[PDB]
Amino acid sequence: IVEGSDAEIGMSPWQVMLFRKSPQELLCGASLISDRWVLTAAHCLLYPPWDKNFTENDLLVRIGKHSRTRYERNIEKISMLEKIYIHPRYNWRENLDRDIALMKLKKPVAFSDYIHPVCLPDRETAASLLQAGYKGRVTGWGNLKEQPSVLQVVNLPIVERPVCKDSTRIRITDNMFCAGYKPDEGKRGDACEGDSGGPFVMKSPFNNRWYQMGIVSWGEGCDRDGKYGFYTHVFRLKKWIQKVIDQ
């Protein structure tokens, strides 16, 4: 995260570190959506251009963390993957269309003060909150510019689709949205490398709950003027989500 702040303790209790065994390193962000299910970007597990193809046994999930590098004894939970599932129409050749994967954990995790699932959106919450100018929040442990001691946080506005498209020569799909401040605006900030697969969340003003509207997908640089971060449209893929979950 570039131009973010240090997270508060328990601010993002659904935040999940994707952790590589050897080398023992940060791969991606991710999110906890129930006791046995973790949501991430497909490109965290499978991205042939940067030589990436992970199997279950290469990877761990670390839940409940705040420190990037410490082993947070009595606080974090490190879990094992039973199964990875990449969306079958995931487009890694072109534009990262349908950049989404689910990970089933080998056993359920116990919730705690630091470990709690985020909500997935329903149609109406999507239709009501996913509007240009409305802000969501991104968190993670990725680089501070194009590395943090602790989880970082930034609040970013959703950007009008035409602007997203005119910022880039990539072909945007309806399964993605973009966010970020415009050049003229007073504020800046962005995700960066190591934040990807993490959650873009919004807080409903109707029921006071946090909804995962986005997954951190890609950007051209980190926090460049006239560029924006691209996010997987979670609601749009939500039928795939509850397919694999009830099956």
């Binding site: 952790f19 065994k21 023992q24 390193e25 940060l26 761990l60 590098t69 410490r70 082993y71 490190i78 094992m80």
Partner: peptide
């Protein structure tokens, strides 16, 4: 870099 994690998870 990263503090080592309990080898029970490895």
């Amino acid at each position: 870099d990263f503090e080592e994690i309990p080898e029970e998870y490895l």
